[PDB]
């Protein structure tokens, strides 16, 4: 059943939770959320994420 | 004397309503196997005792 | 510093050079729970200073341990404990013996069968009925009062209760009760608002079968 909805998640890039103006993202977690996308996620710059 | 005998099996698990003051902070690998095997024993050690 | 170019030296005192590492107070852990990192950070209530550490000798403050026992002549004597089975008053005709025996059982004695009720103030019962613990429709017998946690086990001892119109100048809705010995005002309060009060006065055998039917 869940695959019906998981594959109804077009987002090949992270949503706007991928913001970190509040506080830095967690590198461990991204590696666990890389599966749900196509573009790379873990690669975070030295600066706070801009959003793209 | 009177020791709440109507509570021995009327717990939700096996380790409940059995007063065992002999505990420890960190029960190790085989002290935990010794523990779980212990609660059930004096739960079946008691029963088949009381059945015989 | 009168001038910034001559900074005042750091030559510490017994109020700086002798300190200790800041343990985390219950505020610093309330602000930033990112620091309570081990169970040695769950220190006790601030009011609990620690275990007893001194001899509260009477007539002389609280002495330290290892202190002087020149003045504990009566602490070594108030640690044995009060005389047991012995008149407290050594001389002077004990104040109890001076007063006369009254009412051969006592001034407020409870014999087997005394009619001493626990007081259920009407304000309590009226407070509940609006709060919603008690249903105003169903004649509110003591089962409802007990099971709705209006009154606990430690207050229903035979015989059940007594309704007391405490400061309740008015009861607004028709209220029905089956309790034991309402006070005459409490009766004339329910009876004015179209209610009832049929005082059940059950034996103890009836007190059980009403609470655990």
């Amino acid at each position: 059943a869940m695959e019906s909805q998981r594959q109804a998640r077009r987002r090949d890039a992270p949503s706007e939770w991928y913001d970190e103006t509040e506080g830095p993202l967690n590198p461990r977690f991204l590696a666990s959320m890389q599966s749900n996308y196509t573009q790379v996620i873990t690669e975070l710059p030295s600066s706070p994420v801009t959003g793209r | 004397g009177f020791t709440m005998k109507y509570k021995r099996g009327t717990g939700l698990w096996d380790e409940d309503h059995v007063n065992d003051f002999d505990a420890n902070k960190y029960l190790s690998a085989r002290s935990t196997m010794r523990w779980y095997y212990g609660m059930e024993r004096l739960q079946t050690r008691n029963n088949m005792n009381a059945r015989r | 510093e009168f001038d910034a170019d001559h900074p005042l030296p750091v030559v510490g005192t017994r109020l700086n050079e002798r300190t200790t590492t800041h343990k985390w107070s219950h505020w610093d852990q309330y602000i930033n729970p990112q620091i309570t990192q081990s169970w040695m950070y769950l220190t006790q209530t601030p009011e609990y200073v620690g275990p007893r550490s001194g001899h509260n000798v009477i007539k002389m403050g609280w002495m330290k341990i290892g202190g002087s026992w020149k003045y504990s002549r009566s602490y070594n004597d108030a640690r044995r404990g009060f005389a047991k089975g012995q008149w407290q008053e050594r001389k002077m005709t004990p104040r109890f013996m001076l007063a006369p025996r009254v009412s051969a059982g006592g001034p407020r004695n409870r014999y087997e069968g005394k009619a001493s009720f626990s007081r259920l103030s009407l304000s309590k019962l009226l407070w509940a009925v609006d709060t919603g613990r008690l249903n105003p429709n169903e004649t509110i017998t003591l089962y409802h009062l007990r099971n709705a946690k209006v009154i606990a086990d430690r207050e229903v001892v035979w015989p059940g209760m007594v309704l007391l119109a405490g400061n309740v100048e008015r009861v607004p809705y028709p209220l029905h009760i089956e309790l034991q010995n309402a006070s005459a005002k409490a009766i004339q309060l329910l009876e004015e608002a179209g209610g009832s009060f049929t005082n059940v006065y059950m034996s103890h055998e009836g007190l059980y079968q009403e609470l655990h039917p």
């Binding site: - | - | 219950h26 505020w27 309330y30 601030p46 304000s123 009226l126 407070w127 609006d130 709060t131 919603g132 613990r133 249903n135 105003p136 309740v168 100048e169 008015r170 009861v171 607004p172 809705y173």
Partner: protein
């Protein structure tokens, strides 16, 4: 009581209080029916609508523009968080302190509104509560006439 409510209506308190008359749960079929909506169809009332004891839901905020910085919850049984314990009950000492136990928010912006009430009672703040000392069951009555005025 109105007599106490002045000693709050006189204070220089931010977060103003409800006017006294509109703070009252105590005031046309037959000169108007009772409060708890017993309507004309043979008088069906609604259970928690009238209370002769003085219980009622919180009246609400003081004024819409302001945001109160503390929130004092109610107990599981309805009444308010003020409790007057005693110093050293074991010796039956008649020297009492209060305890405001069920509050959340910033107690300091709450306790900084008790100070303006009791400019002379030692008030201490803790994580859960707010101890105010040397204030007995009449101070318990001053609080609730305030925690009602604040609208909680």
């Amino acid at each position: 009581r109105s007599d106490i409510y002045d000693e709050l209506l006189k204070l220089p308190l931010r977060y103003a209080l409800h006017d006294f008359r509109t703070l009252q749960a105590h005031i046309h079929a037959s000169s108007g029916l009772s409060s708890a909506s017993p309507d004309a169809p043979a008088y069906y009332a609604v259970a928690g609508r009238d209370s002769a004891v003085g219980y009622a839901p919180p009246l609400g905020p003081a004024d819409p523009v302001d945001v109160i910085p503390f929130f004092v919850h109610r107990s599981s049984n309805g009444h308010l968080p003020g409790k007057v314990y005693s110093m050293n009950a074991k010796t039956l000492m008649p020297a009492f302190y209060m305890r405001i136990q069920n509050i959340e928010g910033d107690m300091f912006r709450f306790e900084e509104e008790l100070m303006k009430i009791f400019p002379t009672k030692k008030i201490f703040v803790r994580s859960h509560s707010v101890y105010v000392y040397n204030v007995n069951l009449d101070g318990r009555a001053v609080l609730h006439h305030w925690l009602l005025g604040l609208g909680f």
